Design a protein around this ligand. Structure first.
Ligand SMILES: CCCCCCCCCCCCO[C@H]1O[C@H](CO)[C@@H](O[C@H]2O[C@H](CO)[C@@H](O)[C@H](O)[C@H]2O)[C@H](O)[C@H]1O
Lengths: 195, 97, 49, 97
C-alpha cells in the first residue's frame, strides 16, 4: 500500500506539470524518508501499521509543500528571466510562509501526542513520525530545490495555459464574479450549511 | 492554506493596487497551486482506504479537505471584500488606532 | 520579517559541493540504517493489572 | 582441537575458557560504533573544505600512519595492547589535523 500511495502521488505530479519537472522532486522525496528512518533508529521507534499510516500522511503533506515551491519557482522563472537568481527572489519571498504553515500543522498534530491514556501509546508513534518528517521536509525543500533546479531544469518560455482546464477556468471565474455579485447570499448559504 | 492565501493577497496589495483586481490576480495566481495542494492532501489515503483500520477517518479527511478547499476558493474572497468595502462592527477606542 | 537576513538563497546557491556531500552522506546513512530498523505488529501499550 | 571436537556426538560441545571471550565481548560494540563516528569526523572535515579531491588527499595520510605503530613494536616484541587499540584512533585524528 505504501508503494501504491507513492506511485499515485507520482502520477499526480506527472500530470500536474506534464514535463519531467516535479519528477525530480519525487526523487527528492525518499531523502526525508531515510532521514526519519534513522531518526526512528536513534529513538528505537520500530515499525508498525500506525507509523506506516503516519508516513503516508507526512509524505503527502511534505511533497505538497515541495511541489508548490517548485511550481512557483518554475512559473516565476518561465514568465520572466530564466535564471537561478530569477528565482532567488521567489525563494526569499515565499520561504517564511512554508515554515509558518508547516509549524502550524505540526502544532495541530501535537494534541494527540500528549494524553496519558492507554490509547496515547498508539498515537505517540504517529505523532513523532509526523513531527520529525514535516520538519525535515521543510528543511529539505528549502535546502535542495536550488541544485535540483539548476541541473535538471530547462530555460524560460512564454505564458500559456492548458486549454483542457480552459472550461474549468471559465466556470471558476464566472462563479467568482457571481459570488461577488451578491456577497450576502454567500454568507447566508454558509450560515445555513454550517447550521 | 488559508494563511498562504491571505499572505498572497496582502503581498502585492502593499502597492495599493485596485482591491478588486488585486484579489482577482491573487486568485488567478493561486488557482493552480491550491489544486495540487488539495490533491496531495485528499489523495495518499486512497490506497490505504481499503484497510479497515484507517476507515472513517480516511473518508472524513478526504471530505473535509475538498469542502474547506472549495470554500477557500469562493467563500473567503467574497467575505474579505465585504469586510473591506465597509467595516461592519464598531466599538471605537478613542485612545487606540 | 526579511530584516538583516534572507541569505538562504545565495548561501544555498553557494557552497554547492557542501550540500551535495551532506545529501549523499544522509542518504547512505538512512539506507544502511533501514535494514537494522526493526519490525513489529504494533506498540505494546503498558498493561496495568 | 576443532577437528577433535568435530569428532564427537552432536549433543556435546566444547568452548574456550581463556581471555579471548572477554576481549571480544569488550570490543563488541566498538566495531558497531566506530564507523559512524568515522563518517561524522569525515563530514566535519568536509565542512572546512569544499572538494572531495582534497578530502581523499588528506585521507590518504590517515591509514599510512600504521607504519611506525608497528615498526616501533616488532623488535621490542611487545604484545598489541588494548590501550594502543584505542590510541591509534587519536593518532588518526591528530595526523588528519
Ligand atoms: C559521569 C556521568 C556520566 C556517566 C555515564 C554516561 C555515559 C554517556 C551517557 C549515556 C547515554 C547513551 O547514549 C548513547 O547510546 C548509544 C550507545 O550505543 C549511542 O548510539 C546510538 O545512536 C546512534 C545514532 O542514532 C546509533 O547508530 C546507535 O545504533 C545507537 O546505539 C548514542 O549515540 C549515545 O547517545
Amino acid at each position: 500500500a505504501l508503494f501504491e500511495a507513492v506511485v499515485i502521488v507520482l502520477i499526480v505530479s506527472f500530470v500536474s506539470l506534464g514535463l519531467r519537472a516535479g519528477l525530480v522532486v519525487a526523487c527528492s522525496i525518499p531523502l526525508v524518508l531515510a532521514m526519519v528512518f534513522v531518526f526512528m533508529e536513534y529513538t528505537d521507534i520500530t515499525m508498525q501499521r500506525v507509523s506506516l499510516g503516519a508516513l503516508i500522511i507526512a509524505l503527502g503533506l511534505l511533497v505538497d509543500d515541495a511541489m508548490i515551491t517548485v511550481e512557483m519557482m518554475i512559473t516565476r522563472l518561465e514568465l520572466g528571466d530564466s535564471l537561478h537568481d530569477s528565482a532567488t527572489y521567489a525563494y526569499t519571498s515565499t520561504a517564511f510562509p512554508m515554515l509558518t504553515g508547516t509549524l502550524v500543522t505540526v502544532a495541530g498534530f501535537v494534541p494527540i501526542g500528549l494524553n496519558a491514556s492507554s490509547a496515547g501509546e498508539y498515537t505517540f508513534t504517529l505523532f513523532a513520525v509526523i513531527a520529525v518528517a514535516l520538519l525535515l521536509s521543510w528543511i529539505v525543500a528549502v535546502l535542495f530545490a536550488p541544485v535540483i533546479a539548476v541541473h535538471i531544469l530547462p530555460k524560460t518560455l512564454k505564458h500559456k495555459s492548458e486549454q483542457k482546464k480552459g472550461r474549468i477556468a471559465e466556470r471558476f471565474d464566472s462563479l467568482l464574479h457571481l459570488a461577488m455579485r451578491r456577497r450576502w447570499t454567500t454568507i447566508f448559504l454558509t450560515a445555513l450549511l454550517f447550521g | 492554506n488559508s494563511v498562504i492565501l491571505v499572505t498572497q493577497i496582502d503581498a502585492f496589495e502593499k502597492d495599493g493596487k485596485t482591491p478588486w483586481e488585486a484579489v482577482l490576480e491573487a486568485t488567478h495566481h493561486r488557482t493552480r497551486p491550491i489544486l495540487l495542494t488539495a490533491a496531495a492532501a485528499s489523495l495518499g489515503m486512497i490506497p490505504i482506504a481499503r484497510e479497515v483500520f484507517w476507515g472513517p477517518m480516511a473518508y472524513a479527511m478526504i471530505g473535509g479537505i475538498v469542502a474547506a478547499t472549495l470554500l477557500t476558493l469562493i467563500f473567503l474572497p467574497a467575505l474579505y471584500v465585504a469586510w473591506y468595502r465597509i467595516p461592519e462592527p464598531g466599538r471605537h477606542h478613542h485612545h487606540h488606532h | 520579517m526579511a530584516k538583516g537576513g534572507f541569505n538562504l538563497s545565495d548561501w544555498a546557491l553557494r557552497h554547492q559541493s557542501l550540500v551535495w556531500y551532506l545529501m549523499a552522506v544522509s542518504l547512505v546513512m538512512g539506507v544502511f540504517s533501514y535494514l537494522n530498523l526493526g519490525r513489529e505488529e504494533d506498540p505494546s501499550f503498558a498493561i496495568k493489572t | 582441537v576443532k577437528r577433535f571436537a568435530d569428532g564427537l556426538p552432536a549433543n556435546y560441545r566444547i568452548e574456550v575458557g581463556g581471555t579471548v571471550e572477554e576481549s571480544g565481548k569488550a570490543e563488541g560494540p566498538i566495531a558497531k560504533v566506530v564507523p559512524l563516528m568515522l563518517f561524522l569526523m569525515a563530514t566535519f572535515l568536509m565542512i572546512q573544505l569544499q572538494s572531495v579531491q582534497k578530502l581523499f588527499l588528506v585521507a590518504s595520510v590517515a591509514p599510512l600512519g600504521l607504519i611506525g605503530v608497528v615498526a616501533a613494536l616488532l623488535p621490542t616484541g611487545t604484545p598489541m595492547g588494548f590501550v594502543a587499540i584505542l590510541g591509534i584512533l587519536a593518532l588518526i585524528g591528530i595526523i588528519i589535523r
